[PDB]
Design an enzyme around this catalytic site. Structure first.
Site, mmCIF file in Angstrom:
data_model
loop_
_atom_site.group_PDB
_atom_site.id
_atom_site.type_symbol
_atom_site.label_atom_id
_atom_site.label_comp_id
_atom_site.label_asym_id
_atom_site.label_seq_id
_atom_site.Cartn_x
_atom_site.Cartn_y
_atom_site.Cartn_z
ATOM 1 N N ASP A 147 23.416 80.324 72.775
ATOM 2 C CA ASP A 147 23.924 81.197 73.841
ATOM 3 C C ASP A 147 24.746 82.230 73.111
ATOM 4 O O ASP A 147 25.100 82.028 71.904
ATOM 5 C CB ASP A 147 24.741 80.447 74.884
ATOM 6 C CG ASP A 147 24.753 81.137 76.244
ATOM 7 O OD1 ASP A 147 24.684 82.387 76.306
ATOM 8 O OD2 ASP A 147 24.840 80.410 77.265
HETATM 9 C C1 LIG Z 1 32.166 88.259 76.574
HETATM 10 C C2 LIG Z 1 30.741 88.161 76.970
HETATM 11 O O1 LIG Z 1 30.381 87.346 77.766
HETATM 12 O O2 LIG Z 1 29.742 89.012 76.414
HETATM 13 C C3 LIG Z 1 28.415 88.964 76.903
HETATM 14 C C4 LIG Z 1 27.554 89.859 76.066
HETATM 15 O O3 LIG Z 1 26.768 88.730 75.794
HETATM 16 C C5 LIG Z 1 27.648 87.798 76.367
HETATM 17 C C6 LIG Z 1 26.866 86.918 77.293
HETATM 18 C C7 LIG Z 1 26.805 87.352 78.744
HETATM 19 O O4 LIG Z 1 25.620 86.777 79.290
HETATM 20 C C8 LIG Z 1 24.958 85.591 79.067
HETATM 21 O O5 LIG Z 1 25.053 84.168 79.064
HETATM 22 C C9 LIG Z 1 23.805 83.553 79.373
HETATM 23 C C10 LIG Z 1 22.796 83.872 78.277
HETATM 24 O O6 LIG Z 1 21.522 83.316 78.624
HETATM 25 C C11 LIG Z 1 22.656 85.378 78.085
HETATM 26 O O7 LIG Z 1 21.881 85.639 76.909
HETATM 27 C C12 LIG Z 1 24.022 86.041 77.951
HETATM 28 O O8 LIG Z 1 23.870 87.463 78.000
HETATM 29 C C13 LIG Z 1 26.876 88.868 78.903
HETATM 30 C C14 LIG Z 1 25.668 89.408 78.162
HETATM 31 C C15 LIG Z 1 26.669 89.004 80.386
HETATM 32 O O9 LIG Z 1 25.652 89.444 80.850
HETATM 33 C C16 LIG Z 1 27.733 88.586 81.310
HETATM 34 O O10 LIG Z 1 27.293 88.667 82.619
HETATM 35 C C17 LIG Z 1 28.948 89.441 81.170
HETATM 36 C C18 LIG Z 1 30.134 88.826 81.053
HETATM 37 C C19 LIG Z 1 30.299 87.373 81.392
HETATM 38 C C20 LIG Z 1 31.334 89.565 80.526
HETATM 39 O O11 LIG Z 1 32.151 88.668 79.782
HETATM 40 C C21 LIG Z 1 33.545 88.605 80.185
HETATM 41 O O12 LIG Z 1 33.869 89.060 81.276
HETATM 42 C C22 LIG Z 1 34.552 87.942 79.265
HETATM 43 O O13 LIG Z 1 35.325 86.996 79.972
HETATM 44 C C23 LIG Z 1 35.601 88.864 78.704
HETATM 45 N N1 LIG Z 1 36.329 88.170 77.669
HETATM 46 C C24 LIG Z 1 37.585 88.490 77.402
HETATM 47 O O14 LIG Z 1 38.214 89.257 78.114
HETATM 48 C C25 LIG Z 1 38.250 87.915 76.196
HETATM 49 C C26 LIG Z 1 38.715 86.624 76.214
HETATM 50 C C27 LIG Z 1 39.340 86.118 75.092
HETATM 51 C C28 LIG Z 1 39.495 86.881 73.955
HETATM 52 C C29 LIG Z 1 39.032 88.175 73.936
HETATM 53 C C30 LIG Z 1 38.412 88.688 75.060
HETATM 54 C C31 LIG Z 1 35.021 90.114 78.193
HETATM 55 C C32 LIG Z 1 34.685 90.260 76.865
HETATM 56 C C33 LIG Z 1 34.156 91.452 76.442
HETATM 57 C C34 LIG Z 1 33.970 92.489 77.335
HETATM 58 C C35 LIG Z 1 34.312 92.334 78.655
HETATM 59 C C36 LIG Z 1 34.837 91.145 79.081
HETATM 60 C C37 LIG Z 1 30.968 90.738 79.632
HETATM 61 C C38 LIG Z 1 29.553 91.283 79.737
HETATM 62 O O15 LIG Z 1 29.679 92.687 79.752
HETATM 63 C C39 LIG Z 1 28.701 90.915 78.503
HETATM 64 O O16 LIG Z 1 29.554 91.333 77.408
HETATM 65 C C40 LIG Z 1 29.639 92.663 76.855
HETATM 66 O O17 LIG Z 1 29.148 93.610 77.406
HETATM 67 C C41 LIG Z 1 30.368 92.819 75.559
HETATM 68 C C42 LIG Z 1 31.093 91.762 75.025
HETATM 69 C C43 LIG Z 1 31.753 91.908 73.828
HETATM 70 C C44 LIG Z 1 31.699 93.099 73.143
HETATM 71 C C45 LIG Z 1 30.985 94.141 73.663
HETATM 72 C C46 LIG Z 1 30.324 94.002 74.864
HETATM 73 C C47 LIG Z 1 28.263 89.403 78.370
HETATM 74 C C48 LIG Z 1 28.908 90.947 81.058
HETATM 75 C C49 LIG Z 1 27.544 91.618 81.053
HETATM 76 C C50 LIG Z 1 29.676 91.541 82.211
#
Ligand SMILES: CC(=O)O[C@@]12CO[C@@H]1C[C@H](O[C@@H]1OC[C@@H](O)[C@H](O)[C@H]1O)[C@@]1(C)C(=O)[C@H](O)C3=C(C)[C@@H](OC(=O)[C@H](O)[C@@H](NC(=O)c4ccccc4)c4ccccc4)C[C@@](O)([C@@H](OC(=O)c4ccccc4)[C@H]21)C3(C)C
Ligand SMILES: CC(=O)N[C@@H]1[C@@H](O)[C@H](O[C@@H]2O[C@H](CO[C@H]3O[C@H](CO[C@@H]4O[C@H](CO)[C@@H](O)[C@H](O)[C@@H]4O[C@H]4O[C@H](CO)[C@@H](O)[C@H](O)[C@@H]4O)[C@@H](O)[C@H](O[C@H]4O[C@H](CO)[C@@H](O)[C@H](O)[C@@H]4O)[C@@H]3O)[C@@H](O)[C@H](O[C@H]3O[C@H](CO)[C@@H](O)[C@H](O)[C@@H]3O[C@H]3O[C@H](CO)[C@@H](O)[C@H](O)[C@@H]3O)[C@@H]2O)[C@@H](CO)O[C@H]1O
Ligand SMILES: CC(=O)N[C@@H]1[C@@H](O)[C@H](O[C@@H]2O[C@H](CO[C@H]3O[C@H](CO[C@@H]4O[C@H](CO)[C@@H](O)[C@H](O)[C@@H]4O[C@H]4O[C@H](CO)[C@@H](O)[C@H](O)[C@@H]4O)[C@@H](O)[C@H](O[C@H]4O[C@H](CO)[C@@H](O)[C@H](O)[C@@H]4O)[C@@H]3O)[C@@H](O)[C@H](O[C@H]3O[C@H](CO)[C@@H](O)[C@H](O)[C@@H]3O[C@H]3O[C@H](CO)[C@@H](O)[C@H](O)[C@@H]3O)[C@@H]2O)[C@@H](CO)O[C@H]1O
Ligand SMILES: CC(=O)O[C@@]12CO[C@@H]1C[C@H](O[C@@H]1OC[C@@H](O)[C@H](O)[C@H]1O)[C@@]1(C)C(=O)[C@H](O)C3=C(C)[C@@H](OC(=O)[C@H](O)[C@@H](NC(=O)c4ccccc4)c4ccccc4)C[C@@](O)([C@@H](OC(=O)c4ccccc4)[C@H]21)C3(C)C
Ligand code: NAG
Ligand code: NAG
Ligand code: NAG
Ligand code: NAG
Ligand code: NAG
Ligand code: NAG
Ligand code: NAG
Ligand code: NAG
Ligand code: NAG
Ligand code: NAG
Lengths: 756, 756
Positions: free
Chosen positions: B253
């Site tokens: 993941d």
């Molecule tokens: C942090 C994160 O979750 O990143 C992502 C990018 O890939 C992961 C996975 C997630 O989806 C999936 O899980 C199931 C698998 O089958 C899939 O392959 C996988 O993609 C992601 C792609 C996604 O679609 C998801 O819906 C998204 C989530 C859950 C967002 O995540 C968060 O909100 C985090 O809680 C938050 N974290 C923190 O604030 C934090 C905590 C502790 C220390 C530091 C930071 C966070 C982290 C980064 C950015 C925003 C929020 C984020 C997604 O946007 C997506 O992530 C990104 O776009 C991204 C992450 C990191 C760097 C650059 C971009 C997740 C979002 C699509 C909304």
């Protein structure tokens, strides 16, 4: 001194009159007083029964798009909307469909149509939309046909509002709640109107109403030369009942009657609403009129004439032998009237499609840079709350469509506010019609329908959506209502913001405007990113499904503007709305006959879009003007006759005789089938006279590419005359008459001169 | 010590394996390291190319309703929604349609389906909706068919999430932004699971996934017994790759990988997303894995196996000789990836109607007092923003359907939030489908779709509208998303308020619920004014047009609940979601196999609606149970084989051999055609064993009144076995096996006993 002239039944109502008089002659003073004043009931107004002679209560009911405050009916487009079709057939059918729903709901008298009050002095008029053209001739034609359509359905008409009722502000209907009376605050606005203007401009459409057989006329809220319309002897007794030979009744607007005795002597037939609305709008003739007859102050003769005028309509439409059904809805509303409503469904097959057809025929193309008709775009964006539902429901604004909050998202503007509105069984939203088509194309479509200025994310959502859309629709509106005039031409809601955003993120923006009148789009009209602009007016319940076929080329747009669209409110007749706290407010019609395009034409002012303008998806080339002086005919088809004096009168002829007919030829010079509204203007020579005046129109339906059709314009004696103030009669002047023909009031490729 | 076992290609992939190994055997260390780790690209993840041998980048792409973040596609209903149909055919067709859109958009590996992680320990799970039944058997069946549908379309599956991934809270994916690392804050939740539970409950559906030929499996964010799933040797090396004989690859993941060497040694095949997402989710094996091979720390042999497991899928689905098209959409999003998107339309005729059919087959009738099916009511009221559009557009919430504001009116809940969501070309709103029908009936219809608690006039509009409506529809929803668990069963938005108002002003309220899971309706469920209750789950783009035919009787409802609907959150497995700031969070699965209905059944707890419950417009009477021991068959149809040890193994037979088949007869005992989901439960004797366990289902389609049909339930050796913790193998126990059959998990009119 303008004496009350006696009714005689005129032309078509001779036998009804005779019955009316026989019945009236039997009545006691109580019964005369009963039928001439309003009583409590389910309808907007209710005449008292004459129960001993089996004369029932008559149900008088708003309004000019059909029965208001009623379920089981259809929401027709507004008068404005039919005007814009320039289609006589549609004008009639609309009124005929309105009539069956009126009749089938139980209405005796429809408070409809609006036949030249307001006519169009000001483009800010809150209720201008209820009328039809800002033009006496066209308003005339549509008024005649609207009256015919209602009377042919068995419903009696109260054509309104007589007269010079040209602003809502300070109209000041009489109301005496507590001791807090309107007489203690301000008199109604006083339209000060000269004799030539009153005859050539304001009376014109009411002459047509009379001739179509309007059973009644409603006197207006305003004063004229400082005397209430409803008690203006010159207005009612001489202009209406002597010169126009009006055989029917004068019904007061609700709170239009301000006194007992002058009203009785000066031309009023019916006091409304009387005991309705808590008697708060005045009740000057009930018991009070009984005492006035009995004590010698008002003659029984005079009130007998009022009652005969009321009962003529009743007998002429066979409401005695073929009574309307019972009326079943509380249209007043609790707590003013606490009564339950029943239920009846009166929507007939064919009505929804007629409402549609009026929409499709009315929608007016103002700019087309090349983006229309659409073909099969794959990605559609839609902007504006006007594209979808009222978020509280289509009838959430209540019985008069005026009670939602100032900031509510009311959805598509399918009608205006006030006594002229009506309920809707549903609304077919632009977005839903567009979605339907988009599905057929295997396309995608998304709409931002929130208030873009106040909803979190809305601007970011628009910024993200627009750049990849093949086309962006922006839906704009501008609500107005009876009781107030629009402060300016500004768009309603977040119109300005929506347009700013849309041009920033899209270079193929298509703008659709649902409106009660002209709006300000100067900031966007000339932007290349706005590729098309349409105005759809007030299309009624079939808003979406009438517009989408035009957008997609299924049918080419054929509507044209029923007023002038000026770039600034400053370009119109001055003091169009007078705002004052003066006890006796004055509005001097110093412009005379120069309203709408006549002002613009005489003053050398360029509109953005002129009266009679509207584009097609093709072009029409006008050739071969013919004026045929041997194609004259005797006026045989008027239901009722006026007594308008005219110089050429020889005992045998009429002011409405057709003296010549004029022809032209149009040819479809472009690449697609199209319909065209050919217009004819006449410059009538004289001192201080309009550059030109509409005197004909004719719409060719579905002219194929390369084909041609003849257009025909019958010209009446009146169409070429002027009012002589000195001689008090109509006359054909001397001089050269320029006769112009074409596609707008400013696109007149055919001219010739006629000199008698 | 659980050594990494070598891939051999198993049953169906023998030739692909041989090719994979030939190709892998040619690679340099750089190239091994390239293909086993993620690179920057347009897809959710992208494997590195092996450019010298013509091995392209593979596009790995979310998600389990179809390709996410993509235009030109369809929004399918969620897994939850197909579960509720209990229809194997629909389960397959859905996955097959998802597959062609995946393939036709250019995806090599679909990150789909969800095959028992989360399975359903807690009903508050934010992403439970992505799965299917809270039941190993049914989840098994739907997981098998979903895998088959995707692989048959040419797309490789990453079945997810292995394993015991039963809560979003504290899942704590690895992320190292700045120095602000997740290792510095909290470890992922630790599912502490005993050996019997892991085999009989959690592994069950993943065995089915394996058998259907899932090309890959995704290891989950959680730890198990305090070791990350993605580096748990017992989990990946022994349970998955030895006991289930899994020949495919383990993909991390996104942020599931926490170290370099243990991941490499303990079962991980693919590090995702690697260089994508700024390398912020860990990048433990790129250049780092090169140095580890080259310096003697991880054997080249071990990484060769990883690469062979990746490439097997590629060759088995002919992606070498029949490559997917190029993938064209930036699904990551700026500013994380700044790249333009192209456009492709992949919606085929037939897909919209399949999405519809799934809706119509899934919608589950929970209460019907007599108000349904509707006939032809004349006055319809509709309540709830869930009845209409998202006011910012159907895709306004962004790429993962999770970015609209907390209070936005998102419209119909057609899917949930997160990596499992997808864009929509349009949404067919309940209101629009209901309007369409209402027009056909010459009826009227009005909807209050504002937030009733905060919009001025909304409560007054509802109070006025409801009392004269023949029927009132209330549309309720409950959004959840990946990344958080629902705090409780409360309705979303103004659900509670809408229900309060509706019962106060209407005594024929019909409630439709679009939801990601169970909600709290205890306050209204027993009110006589609520005459019907339906749950429609997450129906995708055809929300309205799948529901209205069921409402109107065109087709009778045939869906049934895929989980238990308890009256209180307290009635379920305790500590379903653990909330702690402890550095090393623990979740002990002390309930064992007792989740969902097994908890309720064993603990004597009464649900409001039980697992397998759903009403028809007719009744079905169950007769004539037959257990036929001569109807046995050899397991020939599994794509791949497990190595699950079992006591009855004789070298020639299988755990998935069908040992007997059981029959029953249903008869349509009511007044209308109907479809029925017959269910079969088996009580398997033993210590601390479920009251009963689902082991069959069969749906009879459109059984006419008076007619009868046989229902048939093939029973497999596994279906009757238990895991011996002592002997580490499956065995058929001794005792009496009760076999029950009927219409729900609690409506079991047929019982018999089988004793071997
Ligand atoms: C942090 C994160 O979750 O990143 C992502 C990018 O890939 C992961 C996975 C997630 O989806 C999936 O899980 C199931 C698998 O089958 C899939 O392959 C996988 O993609 C992601 C792609 C996604 O679609 C998801 O819906 C998204 C989530 C859950 C967002 O995540 C968060 O909100 C985090 O809680 C938050 N974290 C923190 O604030 C934090 C905590 C502790 C220390 C530091 C930071 C966070 C982290 C980064 C950015 C925003 C929020 C984020 C997604 O946007 C997506 O992530 C990104 O776009 C991204 C992450 C990191 C760097 C650059 C971009 C997740 C979002 C699509 C909304
Ligand atoms: C402004 C307006 O529209 N007013 C109309 C009235 O015009 C109309 O009544 C008719 O008036 C006809 C006369 O036309 C001239 O009348 C006005 C003259 O008075 C002026 O007042 C102003 C001051 O405010 C002065 O500016 C002006 O000089 C004059 O006043 C004074 O002049 C003398 C100085 O030399 C001075 O000694 C006096 O103080 C005197 O008062 C005038 O206002 C009017 O002007 C308008 O129209 C012209 C032309 O369009 C325009 O250019 C101007 O700007 C204005 O807008 C105009 O010049 C009069 O002929 C009519 O009388 C006929 O009709 C009635 C009713 O049917 C009969 O009872 C009467 O007998 C007569 O009919 C008979 O005669 C004719 C032939 O002569 C026959 O055809 C007919 O069949 C019949 O047998 C009429 O009284 C009223 C109607 O109610 O409405 C006002 O709004
Ligand atoms: C909790 C859980 O699920 N744990 C499992 C492990 O069970 C499993 O490993 C298997 O364990 C099998 C033995 O079963 C018994 O094992 C546990 C015994 O240890 C207990 O520990 C607790 C303390 O925490 C005590 O409560 C208990 O008394 C005992 O501890 C102590 O007992 C002595 C006091 O008298 C004391 O002196 C010592 O201190 C001693 O440690 C026990 O936890 C387990 O209980 C669970 O299951 C029962 C029944 O369902 C249930 O009621 C309980 O509540 C628990 O949930 C159980 O009673 C063992 O047989 C297995 O070994 C086989 O398999 C491996 C791998 O394939 C082989 O290497 C090994 O040789 C052997 O296989 C051979 O033999 C069999 C026939 O014997 C052949 O069939 C086979 O083919 C082969 O030839 C195995 O080790 C692990 C697996 O990784 O998972 C854990 O989660
Ligand atoms: C005041 C008033 O206008 O009353 C009504 C009732 O009948 C009049 C006429 C109006 O419609 C029409 O005009 C065209 C004719 O062809 C029609 O026959 C006629 O109905 C009414 C029926 C209507 O539909 C209209 O749309 C309504 C209006 C314009 C509301 O009127 C106002 O908002 C007034 O400005 C306001 N006046 C004052 O506040 C005030 C000023 C000075 C001194 C004292 C008070 C007002 C007055 C009363 C109540 C509210 C507001 C009111 C209508 O509701 C309707 O009137 C009543 O319901 C009503 C009036 C008086 C007593 C009891 C009930 C008008 C409304 C439908 C919204
Ligand atoms: C206020 C009142 O008394 N109304 C009555 C009504 O009940 C009756 O049906 C009708 C007969 O004409 O006469 C009215 O006066
Ligand atoms: C980051 C980078 O260099 N990308 C290249 C890509 O342009 C090329 O088409 C492909 C051939 O396999 O190899 C990749 O490494
Ligand atoms: C006639 O009756 C009216 C209305 O009651 C009253 O105002 C007036 O003073 C009366 N006049 C006479 C002369 O009695
Ligand atoms: C209607 O009823 C209300 C109380 O329900 C009362 O206050 C009001 O005055 C009533 N109206 C009339 C005209 O009787
Ligand atoms: C037209 O739209 C584009 C975006 O497509 C924008 O860049 C440009 O500024 C706009 N032009 C005008 C005149 O607003
Ligand atoms: C209107 O015109 C009259 C007639 O000359 C004049 O006396 C009056 O004061 C004017 N009122 C205005 C301009 O408001
Ligand atoms: C092997 O390489 C890894 C990654 O660069 C490094 O962490 C480790 O210390 C190295 N070990 C030896 C023995 O060189
Ligand atoms: C994307 O562009 C923005 C500025 O436009 C920049 O800040 C960001 O770092 C870029 N992202 C990458 C991964 O280069
Ligand atoms: C049911 O609805 C009616 C209004 O139709 C209301 O009077 C009554 O209080 C309601 N009953 C319940 C149990 O809420
Ligand atoms: C979970 O169970 C283990 C095994 O007995 C126990 O030692 C641990 O403290 C428990 N953790 C809990 C209840 O959070």
């Amino acid at each position: 001194q303008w004496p009350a002239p006696l009714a005689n039944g005129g032309k078509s109502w001779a036998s009804a009159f005779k019955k009316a008089k026989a019945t009236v002659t039997e009545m006691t003073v109580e019964e005369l007083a009963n039928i001439t004043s309003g009583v409590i009931g389910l309808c907007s107004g209710v005449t008292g029964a004459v129960t001993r002679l089996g004369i029932p209560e008559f149900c008088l009911q708003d309004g000019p798009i059909g029965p208001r405050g009623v379920h089981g009916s259809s929401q027709f487009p507004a008068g404005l909307t039919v005007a814009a079709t320039w289609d006589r057939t549609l004008m009639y059918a609309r009124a005929r469909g309105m009539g069956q729903e009126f009749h089938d709901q139980g209405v005796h008298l429809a408070l409809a149509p609006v036949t030249g009050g307001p006519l169009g002095r000001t483009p800010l008029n809150g209720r201008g939309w209820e009328g039809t053209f800002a033009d006496p001739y066209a308003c005339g034609e549509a008024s005649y046909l609207s009256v015919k359509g209602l009377t042919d359905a068995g419903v009696a008409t109260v054509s309104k509002h007589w007269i010079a009722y040209e602003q809502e502000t300070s109209r000041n209907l009489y109301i005496d709640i507590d001791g807090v009376s309107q007489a203690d605050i301000q008199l109604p606005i006083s339209s000060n109107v000269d004799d030539l203007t009153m005859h050539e401009l304001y009376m014109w459409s009411f002459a047509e109403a009379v001739r179509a057989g309007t059973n009644h006329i409603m006197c207006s809220y305003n004063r004229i030369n400082n005397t209430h319309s409803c008690s203006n002897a010159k207005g009612l007794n001489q202009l209406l009942k002597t010169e126009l030979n009006f055989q029917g009744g004068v019904v007061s607007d609700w709170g239009g009657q301000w006194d007992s005795v002058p009203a009785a002597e000066n031309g009023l037939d019916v006091a409304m609403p009387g005991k309705g609305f808590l008697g708060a709008l005045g009740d000057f003739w009930g018991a009070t009129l009984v005492e006035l007859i009995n004590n010698g102050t008002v003659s029984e003769d005079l009130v007998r004439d009022k009652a005969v005028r009321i009962l003529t309509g009743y007998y002429y439409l066979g409401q005695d032998t073929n009574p309307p059904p019972p009326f079943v809805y509380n249209t007043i509303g609790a707590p003013t009237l606490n009564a339950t409503s029943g239920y009846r469904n009166v929507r007939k097959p064919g009505t929804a499609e007629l409402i549609k057809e009026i929409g499709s025929a009315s929608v007016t193309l103002l700019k087309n840079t090349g983006s229309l008709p659409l073909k099969h775009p794959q990605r559609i964006a839609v902007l504006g709350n006007d594209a979808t539902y009222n978020v509280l429901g289509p009838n959430a604004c209540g019985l008069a469509n005026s009670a939602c909050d100032i900031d509510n998202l009311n959805g598509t503007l399918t009608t205006g506010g006030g006594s002229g509105s009506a309920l809707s069984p549903y609304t077919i939203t632009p977005l839903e019609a567009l979605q339907k088509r988009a599905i057929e194309d295997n396309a995608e479509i998304a709409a931002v329908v929130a208030n873009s200025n106040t909803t979190t994310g809305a601007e970011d959502a628009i910024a993200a959506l627009l750049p990849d859309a093949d086309v962006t629709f922006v839906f704009l509106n501008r609500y107005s209502e009876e009781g107030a005039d629009a402060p300016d031409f500004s768009l309603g809601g977040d119109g300005d913001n929506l347009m700013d955003l849309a041009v920033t993120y899209s270079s193929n923006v298509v703008v659709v405007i649902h409106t009660t009148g002209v709006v300000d789009i100067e900031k966007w009209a000339d932007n290349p990113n706005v590729t098309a602009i349409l105005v759809a007016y007030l299309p009624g319940q079939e808003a979406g499904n009438s517009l989408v076929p035009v957008l997609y080329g299924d049918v080419a747009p054929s509507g044209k503007l029923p007023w002038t669209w000026g770039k600034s409110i400053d370009d119109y007749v001055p003091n169009g709305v007078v705002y004052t706290d003066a006890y006796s407010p004055q509005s001097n019609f110093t412009e005379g006959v120069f309203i709408d395009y006549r002002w613009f034409d005489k003053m050398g002012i360029t509109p953005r879009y002129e009266f009679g303008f509207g584009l097609s998806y093709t072009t029409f080339t006008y050739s071969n003007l013919i004026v045929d002086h041997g194609r004259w005919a005797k006026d045989y088809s008027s239901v009722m006759e006026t007594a308008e004096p005219f110089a050429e009168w020889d005992g045998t002829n009429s002011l409405y005789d057709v003296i010549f007919t004029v022809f032209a030829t149009i040819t479809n010079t472009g690449n697609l089938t199209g319909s065209e509204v050919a217009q004819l203007y006449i410059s009538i020579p004289g001192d201080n006279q309009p550059v030109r005046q509409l005197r004909g129109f004719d719409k060719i339906k579905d002219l194929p590419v390369g084909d041609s059709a003849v257009v025909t314009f019958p010209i009446r004696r009146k169409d070429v005359s002027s009012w002589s103030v000195v001689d008090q009669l109509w006359y054909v002047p001397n001089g050269d008459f320029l006769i112009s023909v074409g596609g707008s009031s400013r696109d007149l490729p055919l001219n010739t001169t006629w000199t008698p």
